[PDB]
Amino acid sequence: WGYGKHNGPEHWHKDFPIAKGERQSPVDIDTHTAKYDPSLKPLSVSYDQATSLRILNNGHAFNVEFDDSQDKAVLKGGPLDGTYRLIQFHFHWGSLDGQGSEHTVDKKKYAAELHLVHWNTKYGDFGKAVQQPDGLAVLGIFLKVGSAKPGLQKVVDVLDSIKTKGKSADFTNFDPRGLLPESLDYWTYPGSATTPPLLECVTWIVLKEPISVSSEQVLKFRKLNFNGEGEPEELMVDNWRPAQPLKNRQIKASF
Ligand SMILES: [Hg+2]
Ligand SMILES: [Hg+2]
Ligand SMILES: [Zn+2]
């Protein structure tokens, strides 16, 4: 599986039949049909004690890993019940500025989309979390091309070090608070992981407010390889899944 013409999203069903499941993600967020739910509590993001460990190219994106052996970096509140721990974050991007995000708003596509992945602690480990309908919580933030994002530069600069598939680099003392928008207003719906095994375990939390990044920062993302070192070069671009049928589900808004 990949994002090419021969192994792209359109082929994934063959290997993972859940691909045409009931609660697949990403989806289009129709701002007029979303339901304002007054019963939604404000999100609670506690990342002051986060411990970053490393970054690695997994061949489909780059992951920034965190120490999730304790309640160091947690998400709670909003539509959630219990504490969810930060395990990693990654992005999806395009080949051009006009495409890149997974989720869309009124059919609008963003340059990229950041995913902060968290697992429900009542389940003890990530691996067991992905066996539950409420096992994960992903915070999705959109990136638009404008001003440079100070807080993202630490990541941009290291990309040179993890150019091909399978490379990793120590990546400590990275503060994820630098990537969050000013406002925490959001839409939420039940879905799935957006990459194989596409398991339907996620409560999606998509922030209304985008963060801006500069042209040069996104340009660096586009310099990554899908391929392993010493192999034909294939630029890591358009590593996004197209929107999936909502299928009855209701998207709720906290505003
Ligand atoms: Hg999953
Ligand atoms: Hg699940
Ligand atoms: Zn993702």
From Swiss-Prot:
Q: Which residues form the active site?
A: 60 (proton donor/acceptor)
**A Pfam match:** Carb_anhydrase
Per the record, what is the consequence of mutating residue 115 to D/N/Q? Answer: Reduced activity
Highest rank taxon of the organism: Eukaryota
Acetylation is among the record's keywords: yes
Q: What is this protein called?
A: Carbonic anhydrase 2
Phosphoserine, modified sites: 161, 168
Q: How does activity depend on pH?
A: Optimum pH is 6-8.
Lineage runs:
Eukaryota, Metazoa, Chordata, Craniata, Vertebrata
Q: Please describe, based on the UniProt annotation, the reported consequence of changing residue 58 to D.
A: Strongly reduced activity
Please describe, based on the UniProt annotation, the reported consequence of changing residue 63 to L: Reduced activity
Per UniProt, what does mutating residue 194 to S/V do? Reduced activity
Annotated Gene Ontology cellular component terms: apical part of cell; cytoplasm; cytosol; extracellular exosome; myelin sheath; plasma membrane
Phenotypic consequence of residue 194 to D/E: Strongly reduced activity, but enhanced zinc affinity
